[PDB]
Paper text:
The main protease of SARS-CoV-2 (Mpro, also referred to as 3-chymotrypsin-like protease or 3CLpro) is responsible for the majority of nsp processing, cleaving at 11 conserved sites along the polyprotein including self-excision of Mpro by autolytic cleavage of its own N-terminal and C-terminal autoprocessing sites. SARS-CoV-2 Mpro is a functional homodimer of two symmetrically disposed protomers that are each 306 residues in length (33.8 kDa). Using C-terminally substituted Mpro chimeras, we have determined X-ray crystallographic structures of Mpro in complex with 10 of its 11 viral cleavage sites, bound at full occupancy intermolecularly in trans, within the active site of either the native enzyme and/or a catalytic mutant (C145A).
Interestingly, the others diverge from this canonical binding, we term here form 2: in C6 (form 2), C10, and C14 (crystallized isomorphously in space group P21 with two molecules in the ASU) the substrate sequence is kinked ~ 90° at the P3 residues and tracks instead between the dynamic Met49 and Gln189 regions. This altered substrate trajectory appears to be coincident with the close contact of the donor C-terminal domain in this crystal packing. P2 valine, unique to cleavage site C6, also maintains a highly analogous set of interactions with a markedly similar S2 pocket, but with a less optimal vdW interaction surface as a result of the gap from the static pocket edge to the shorter beta-branched side chain of the P2(Val) C6 variant. This P2 pose is also remarkably maintained in the kinked form 2 structures, including C6 (form 2) which we have captured in both binding orientations. No major altered side chain amide rotamers are observed in our collective 52 structural visualizations of P1 over the varying substrate products or acyl enzyme intermediates, remarkably even amongst those with markedly varying main chain conformations such as C6 (form 2).
Author numbering:
A (entry chain B), B (entry chain A): 1 to 306
The structure:
Amino acid sequence: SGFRKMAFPSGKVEGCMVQVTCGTTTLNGLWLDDVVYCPRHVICTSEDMLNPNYEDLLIRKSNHNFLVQAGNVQLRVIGHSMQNCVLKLKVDTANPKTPKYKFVRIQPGQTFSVLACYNGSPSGVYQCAMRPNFTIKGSFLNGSAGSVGFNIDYDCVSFCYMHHMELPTGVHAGTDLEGNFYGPFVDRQTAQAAGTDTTITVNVLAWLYAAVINGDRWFLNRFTTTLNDFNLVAMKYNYEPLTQDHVDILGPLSAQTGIAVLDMCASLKELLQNGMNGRTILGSALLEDEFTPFDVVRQCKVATVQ
Amino acid sequence: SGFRKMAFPSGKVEGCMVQVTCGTTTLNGLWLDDVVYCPRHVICTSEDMLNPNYEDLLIRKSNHNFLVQAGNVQLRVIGHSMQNCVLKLKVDTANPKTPKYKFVRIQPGQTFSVLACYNGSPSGVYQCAMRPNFTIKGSFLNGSAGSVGFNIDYDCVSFCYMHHMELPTGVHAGTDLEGNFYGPFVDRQTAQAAGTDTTITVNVLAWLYAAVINGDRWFLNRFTTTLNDFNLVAMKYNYEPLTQDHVDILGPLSAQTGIAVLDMCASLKELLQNGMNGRTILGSALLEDEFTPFDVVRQCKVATVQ
């Protein structure tokens, strides 16, 4: 029993992290086979960030302008190119610790693990969710760009996020591993802002099921509702509408607890309207939305099969 | 910016995890050089756990009775001994992935990263604190015993916890890597009560500093108090006494923010006596106590030196 914010083990990703230096600018790269992937603003000085002309800046860089280090090992750059907002640096050495991997592009609501790195050195691991507004609520300082987000299944690393930038609300934006930003964000100088975020309803429901599985059930009532009725409540409180697909995905949690999904929706409606009144759920005094149904099933080993 | 529950990168520990099976009982072991460390209850079945003569039970076990698998590949046991509540199984193969390591005893209030494992396979990583009542609020199911807790300092892994058991309140107990339990617990099947837990005051202060560093300053009003007056309030709210030693270790956070420790104590006193006014701090609607001062300094790279 118990329930914690849990990341995937990070070892398979640690062996892929390198430092990339161009002049005086440094960030992290991801070394898979004989390519290092990193954010393209490594080619910018502080002066360039007034208005970076990335294509013009890159044309004056040779292979020798890129210093790539895996720990103390120097990886010689033998080619370079730009793909959307990432650079691909071809190196002379293939990474012997390259795991089985895929590059994937995820949807809002999905969670992933982040290996935060500085100067090519892994510092820590934590869990993030892709927010409905395509930001993430990470923990990133200057020098962390190029840190990646990932999930692991059957020893295959699915890389879904490369970190690029921080917005003045304290939230983070980045790309897939082909260099395409999530959301409307750009790595230019435009005075941009994130859209209004909402709460990930299906994840809150998953977390309420985790709470019941772990014995916290004071919030259960006898009532039920419908998708139509519940979604009027969701709109009022800035929650994402619940879809029937979400209801179906919650199936294994409903199956193991015996609590119908629309019954759990009626419990959530009451929590939204009246709050918790000095009580907690899984150690929290607010409704948590960064655990997916998959996250709960995996961490609590939810199964009716024996 | 940002502030997350952050674990150390787990790769160095992943390569040490193995499965130990004795009869129908399976749990995890820690493989360092030519020794596997695991909880001694692997030698027990339902038949002999109320009053297990572990010395007698171990005598009935030969080296062949211990099946050790590293990545589903068998390691041959060539010796076995018991040290307090752990077994040391000598194997004929030294682990080529053994990191630099130390076995350490942590103090109450200190944090560590847990690599949760089942059948020798790492499942996830999360952060825990050693509670004042010497339990931990983990996430552990049957088969997770032998999972370990650790911190990393300069490529040295300091192992501080090996998981053994769950108390009926849903919290967890275990040993150091010398096999001595934290707190008044035994691996015997006696009914065991944890002491009433208390809140880790110095950690709440550290987390309030983390909030300030991240821009969350609504609870600062330039008030200050004395150490004795603060400790009178702490006592009323089930908070641990704050010692001058605790004040000292908050130094780096006070240094970067310019907020004296006793000013932050006055802020915390106000939050305790009057509540959080419905507000959230760093994504929490309650006061969080599982970040140490060092955790904040590490994650936020706190320093006045440039």
